[PDB]
Ligand binder design. Structure first.
Ligand SMILES: [Zn+2]
Lengths: 382, 128, 382
């Protein structure tokens, strides 16, 4: 519809206009439209800067006047034209500090690239918004040289940059670019899915333990989005070091640095169990490790819920118990798929056995019980 | 006949709102004429030159001239946006060029477009 | 008619978010938010957030829909309520307060460029909301921005310079916009702002401010109480300055096209002065008749077509004054030669126009000054 089209264009432009998009980042969409930018000025000169800026301003006018209407793309967001006209300014500002991270890698400056990286955080928020309600810019990106789209190339470049080292700015800009990337993967089709194979190479450095939980959470969401491809699903294991699985499970088992509240924790676990369900509905130690990690997560959640059964009144409580439900169904799937399950889970098997009657009692306590999970628990009983 | 009964007032309104004289674009806000530009773009995507009945088409081509030569590039929209606009334009102009009985109201458009192309080529070969 | 031109009928956020409306200075709005520059970041960021919120509101604002039956009043073209720009008003209020503080003292100049961009902003605001302009006028010092812009007009009336010269133009733009956007009842409260116009009627003001001032004079003379009050001045009932600007021609860089805009506005204002109830008319007719008589046919260029229509309504005003007041003829004797040569010429020229009026044509038949002579001595000629 066109009324809905105009409302979605208004929603996009608003998500661009607001208080600085990413709370705490004092910079906004204007923070980019008119930038002093005192000193790559060669590839992106101040004249080229104003060129990208008025390109963007024209595109913003267009999406103010937007009527972009709507199996390939999961959701018919907008197919909005003004998005690729913002693409000049964001391309400029994202090649910005990408050139500079590359140069600092060549030296191996920082005082300016911190500001550049804040600018690019705002730019990546704009990117997320313009992949929120769009599809002209979303499809144009998916059209690489093979090869890759220029903006896609520079964002993957700075992504590998931030994924190699999780220092001061790299973690934040990494979180932002992974948000962009999971939006792309949600909005693409199966044809462009093999194009993210470069991201599959960049991804182990992202799933490293040193990376904070928001980043790795977005990375797991990206992996689960990628799993819907016969070419990407095999791109999980047969790699001895971790294959982006052993790393994930050592992260969920041993949460690194744990600097967050409790409900922040288990967000990763929910994404992980949803991802493993996605993989199931589709022998590394990639197969063996997911068993003990799932058991230990189920165990800690069974403790946190058994200490105070009560009613599921807080949102984190119902989230934890639903995580318990999908976790036990996943454990039953693990027992179905492998026979060494009981044998190689012995190091934690006791913690699973003590949870088993408690977790079954909890499940029976739920007024809603999927018979699959009930019979799964019964099979887990020995 | 529905077209005919307002053809000449329409063309008069075109010529008046879009006079030949330069600076005529300064009278109107560039976002106005920019949405006018995208409008004419989607019109040529419709192949109005074939789909319409009366060639007095001449008025919309004169409007196209007004846009191209009298109005500078980069004022309403960006030069790349206006460029892809006139790209779709001249492509539709070619499609209608393939089949036409008279060319007077079409040859001028092509002349203006190729003229601006010549000028930008001269500028990018400024001294070479 | 379903979109209601929400995008055009809005603030024109495309316009509000566009390259400098004024010639140069390369601004855009939060570029000013990027510009940390009622004297502190205190309440500066408050006004900035209020303006960003109002922008998001107007983007989401659909005050008029499908035809706008809500906008009612004697004011023709009631734009829409649009409460959004209300929240944008504090930012320009603060910037123009800083500007007025920089004007009252004998400082910095960038605030004045920011000031004129704020004036252009105001012009855009009052361009697209009747409720906004109604509160601008209503709210003694009501709506201190109004009193301080009057103070800006006074500050620019003397010691013109170049920045204040632009301030003259843009402030006259916004006032004539506010004036034209207000109903007849608001002219009585617009009289306070009208009291400042005599200083803009000083023989110093440049041509753009002059023509905008004449437009404001017409908008005020549409009122039945504002016209005699404005004509209650001392020099020539506030119109002596205007008439001597016609004859004086202070600017030579000012194109005669702009002069013709000024002339048509003046003659239309005086015609309205007639409907609400000579030297300058004659000299402008002299120039215009010379220009048209040097051409041997109908004006093929638009500027000379407007010149011909100016001849039309100028002889209309001339016959109106002569029939109203018989002192017109000895108000003509000092310029009787110019008159007796222009009247027959312009009358034959309008006879050259195929369209007729029979009223202006009755005027031609009434005045018809002919032959300007009796005969010249042929003996010792040349
Ligand atoms: Zn594996």
């Amino acid at each position: 519809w066109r009324q809905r089209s105009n409302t979605q264009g208004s929603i996009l432009i608003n998500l661009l206009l607001k208080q600085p998009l990413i709370p705490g980042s004092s910079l906004s969409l204007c923070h980019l439209l008119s930038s002093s930018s005192e000193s790559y000025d060669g590839s992106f000169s101040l004249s080229a800067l104003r060129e990208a800026q008025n390109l963007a301003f024209t595109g913003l006018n267009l999406v103010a006047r937007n009527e972009c209407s709507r199996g390939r793309r999961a959701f018919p967001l907008c197919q909005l034209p003004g998005a690729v006209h913002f693409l000049p300014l964001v391309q400029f500002f994202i090649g910005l500090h990408c050139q500079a991270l590359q140069d600092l890698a060549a030296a191996k400056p920082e005082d300016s690239v911190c500001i550049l990286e804040g600018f690019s955080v705002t730019a990546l928020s704009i990117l997320q918004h313009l992949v929120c309600h769009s599809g002209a810019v979303v499809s144009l990106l998916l059209s690489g040289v093979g090869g890759q789209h220029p903006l896609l190339k520079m964002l993957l470049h700075l992504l590998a940059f931030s994924s190699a080292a999780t220092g001061h700015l790299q973690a934040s800009v990494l979180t932002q670019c992974l948000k962009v990337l999971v939006k792309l993967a949600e909005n693409t089709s199966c044809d462009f899915l093999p194009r993210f194979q470069c991201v599959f190479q960049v991804l182990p450095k992202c799933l490293s333990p040193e990376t904070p939980l928001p980043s790795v959470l977005l990375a797991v969401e990206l992996l689960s989005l990628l799993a819907d491809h016969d070419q990407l699903a095999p791109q999980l294991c047969s790699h001895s070091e971790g294959c982006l699985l052993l790393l994930l499970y050592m992260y969920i088992t041993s949460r690194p640095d744990r600097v967050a509240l409790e409900t922040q924790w288990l967000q990763l676990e929910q994404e992980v169990v949803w991802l493993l369900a996605k993989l199931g509905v589709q022998n590394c130690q990639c197969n063996v490790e997911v068993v003990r990690a799932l058991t230990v997560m189920l165990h800690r959640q069974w403790l946190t819920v058994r200490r105070a059964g009560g009613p599921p009144r807080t949102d984190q409580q119902r989230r934890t118990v639903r995580c318990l439900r999908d976790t036990v169904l996943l454990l039953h799937g693990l027992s179905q798929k492998d026979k060494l399950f009981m044998m190689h889970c012995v190091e934690v098997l006791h913690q699973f056995d003590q949870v088993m009657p408690g977790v079954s009692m909890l499940i029976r306590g739920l007024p809603d019980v999927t018979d699959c999970e009930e019979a799964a628990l019964d099979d887990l009983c020995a | 006949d529905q077209l005919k009964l307002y053809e000449e007032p329409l063309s008069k309104l075109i010529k008046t709102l879009f006079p030949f004289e330069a600076e005529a674009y300064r009278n109107i806000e560039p976002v106005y004429l920019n949405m006018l530009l995208e409008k004419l773009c989607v019109m040529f995507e419709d192949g109005v030159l074939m789909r319409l009945k009366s060639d007095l088409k001449a008025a919309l081509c004169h409007l196209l001239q007004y846009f191209l030569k009298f109005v500078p590039a980069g004022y309403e929209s960006a030069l790349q946006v206006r460029k892809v606009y006139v790209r779709n334009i001249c492509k539709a102009l070619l499609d209608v060029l393939g089949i036409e009985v008279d060319a007077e109201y079409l040859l001028g458009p092509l002349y203006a477009a190729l003229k601006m192309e010549s000028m930008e080529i001269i500028e990018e070969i400024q001294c070479q």
